Design a protein around this ligand. Sequence first.
Ligand code: X17
Length: 367
Amino acid sequence: SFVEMVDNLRGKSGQGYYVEMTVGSPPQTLNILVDTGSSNFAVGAAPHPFLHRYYQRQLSSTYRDLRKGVYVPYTKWEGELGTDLVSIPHGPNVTVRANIAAITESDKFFINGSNWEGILGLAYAEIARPDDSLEPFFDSLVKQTHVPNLFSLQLCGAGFLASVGGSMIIGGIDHSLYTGSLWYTPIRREWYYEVIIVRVEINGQDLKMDCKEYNYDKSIVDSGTTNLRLPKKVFEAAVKSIKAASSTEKFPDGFWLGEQLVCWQAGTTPWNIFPVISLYLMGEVTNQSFRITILPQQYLRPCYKFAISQSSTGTVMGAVIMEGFYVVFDRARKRIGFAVSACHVHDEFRTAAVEGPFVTMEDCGYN
Ligand SMILES: COc1ccc([C@]2([C@]34C[C@H]5C[C@H](C[C@H](C5)C3)C4)N=C(N)N(C)C2=O)cc1C
């Protein structure tokens, strides 16, 4: 019953959504970031100033050492590979033996005060560390249980660091979580959750770009990223258009750079000054697409910060984008569904939307 998975997610604004999990025998309780942007089940397994709890392998009778290290530098974290029994108390009623990367040392990986101690990489083996032979959690879950190869995310944010809530429905779609129709965009390739954006408008105004630019060098849906992140050329075009629309009110550049914050007081925020943003995603039929339309309430995150920023690794549809909608990761049919969320924030003049069809290319993909 999905009803027991409702509101199984919590977090702090800007610091991700986490679900409660247990690992080991007896069960060790840990909060684990839901991350569709990576593919490793990786959990703090040694003391760290930002961790108040951590996985203690020696306390687990069901821990098995894989005798294999793993080192992941970026911008880092290193750990030791093992397997153990994992459950999600407010998830499916099963227990699976899953790969676990036990993080023993890290640098700028954990977040102070996030309240989570590990990461649940929900993307595909191709991008797993150290390599694609380390079966991701969800793969193990499906193989080991009768849980359908699908999960869905309703991220709700805060609404009026702020506390956020949401739901991760594993193995199905909870119709109470959304209104209207679900529209599906193909998963272009099973590594990240890669999709194709075929067009984008700001307040109805088409950015008029070669659609390859929207997916340069790729477009992904990533719960583990807070912001809508856009390729350099698309970002600049987006900000320009947004600056203009909100002209009647000038802000510091630091704000547009996602650095400085902008403040009003108690429901005086002039939301109407900021334009909506429509992302058209490739449909299940070639020259057919649909749009998801987001409000300023989504891309101005709480005083507010500009939750749109520049990317050098392609477009990233992160939390603030997912927060408007109910997002279905239909792995079984290689597609991602979008519908209007039951919990999305909106005012009395505009509302987040998912609408289709809109006729438009397979040539929007950037190899
Ligand atoms: C296996 O290694 C990784 C796993 C996850 C991530 C992150 C990360 C990295 C930090 C910061 C934030 C939250 C959590 C810790 C996961 C994103 N998750 C996403 N989606 N992104 C874009 C990341 O940078 C990064 C790495 C290197």
